[PDB]
Structures are given as structure tokens and as C-alpha cells.
Design a protein around this ligand. Sequence first.
Ligand SMILES: [Cu+2]
Ligand SMILES: [Cu+2]
Length: 309
Amino acid sequence: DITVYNGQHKEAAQAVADAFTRATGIKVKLNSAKGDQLAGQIKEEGSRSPADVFYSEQIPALATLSAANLLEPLPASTINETRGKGVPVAAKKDWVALSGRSRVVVYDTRKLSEKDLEKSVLNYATPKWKNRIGYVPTSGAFLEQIVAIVKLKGEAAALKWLKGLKEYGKPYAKNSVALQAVENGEIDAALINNYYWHAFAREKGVQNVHTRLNFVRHRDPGALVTYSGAAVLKSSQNKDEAKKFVAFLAGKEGQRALTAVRAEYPLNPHVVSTFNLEPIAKLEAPQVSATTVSEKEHATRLLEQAGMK
Ligand SMILES: [Cu+2]
Ligand SMILES: [Cu+2]
């Protein structure tokens, strides 16, 4: 019936495809890769691509496929489903945002409480946090964070943050490696994404975990939410059933099914997650424009300037 190109978590995607099929009876086959490569691969088959729907963890990928006249404009009702202040809107109305995932601080509740954390993510790059703040200089989510500080605060502020993390902080190879470092009692705190912790708590049993999360809010760069979205390709030979799916994904049903398996924040406001997430608006994420190639470029330079790459 339909084929979706999936740059999102397979378990997530499958949950949503299964929920869709059950509800309409329409079959869904998934092509799972990193969004970047699926946007790329779509471009090259132009309008003979087998993709009906592009299910992206990355809005920038939705934007390349849009600037390239490859995406089908969606009903207002669909787009309207996840509208909220702060929510990215397609200028052309040819993709829709679905959920977000946030920057957080995980901390060791055996030695730190909320009163101990900082009001700004920028404040961690200092002697006070010497040997007490971990980071993942190699992660994409870290690179997003750098992008957002340059857009919010300018270039020197970003570079200054990174040099102070480099002198004081402690690097880890993976976000999961660092999480386990706080849980293991090796450092007080670490900058990660939220879903790693929720997944871990859900598997272990929260009474058995000694870490908790801090959200900075206050429109701080550290309150950064990264959004996922979806679009239907203008080449689809299944456009009514492809549009149906995207509507599903934006709808109540689609959204509860998502947030049954994944700790992403629903953009649909009627949806309560199975995870202990506040409403996204309460995160008070900063307004930030889409990340471009140049920006990631800019940021990677900054990383190499600070001594990280
Ligand atoms: Cu991730
Ligand atoms: Cu990751």
C-alpha cells in the first residue's frame, strides 16, 4: 500500500506504522536510514522515487526536499494539528512538524539537587564545574547545541563556551557512555538529550536509578528542542494514502502511538505521553531557525578551534 522513508528511530516508526495499518488497513513498508541519506537518495530519483512519505528526524532534510520542489502541499487541517507557538512552520506548507527532543542536564542525585545546577547551560564552561560536567564533542546533538548558541548569542560566546568545556569539562564518546558515567558515579553531571534517560529509567525502574534530569528553560540555548517532521513526495503514486498517513502522524491517534514507545515531546496538545514529559511549551525552548550546511560547517570549525576536532 505505501512505502515510507524513515530517518527516525525504527522502533518509533514501526509503532506508528503498525498503529496506522490497524486503523485503516493500509500496509506500510519502511526504508530506514539516517534522514540525510534519505533526502539525498530522494533527490536523485527525482520524481521516480518509490517513496510515498518522508519521515524525518531532521527538519533541514525536509527543507532540502522542499526547496527542490519535491514535496506535496498538505491540508491545513494536517498542518494545523501540531501548530503551537514555537513550532516550525513550512513556508510552503509541504511538511509538518511532529515531535521534538530536548537538550538536558543529567545529574547525580546522590550529590546534587536542582538548587545546585545552573540557570544557563553556558555557565557550565567554568572552573566551578571543573571535572564535574561531561560532554560529547562528537555528537550531532552537541553540534546542534553549538549552532544554536552562535544564533542566539553570537560567535564569541559559542567559542568561549567550548574552550571552557575543553579546559574544565570531561569528554565522552557517546551520549549513552556519558549517561552511564553519571549513573556510575564518575562525574556529577553531563549534557545529553532527554530520551536516553527516559528509556533507561523505563527499562531499569526509576527507583533503581540515581540520575535525574534538569531542564533550563528560560529560552536558554540549553533548552534547545530539535524537531522531527514528515512530508509526502509529489511523485508518490499513492498520494491519498500517503497524505492519510501524515495526517495520522499529526493526529491524536498517531501521536499517542508515537509517544508510547519513544520519549519525544508530542506537538499535538491533546496527547499525554506514557513518559513523564511536561508539555513542550513548558520547556520554554528558544526560537531557533533551521540549521544549514554552513552553520554545521561553522560549528565544526569552532570545535576544531577549541581543541575538540
Ligand atoms: Cu538521537
Ligand atoms: Cu544519539
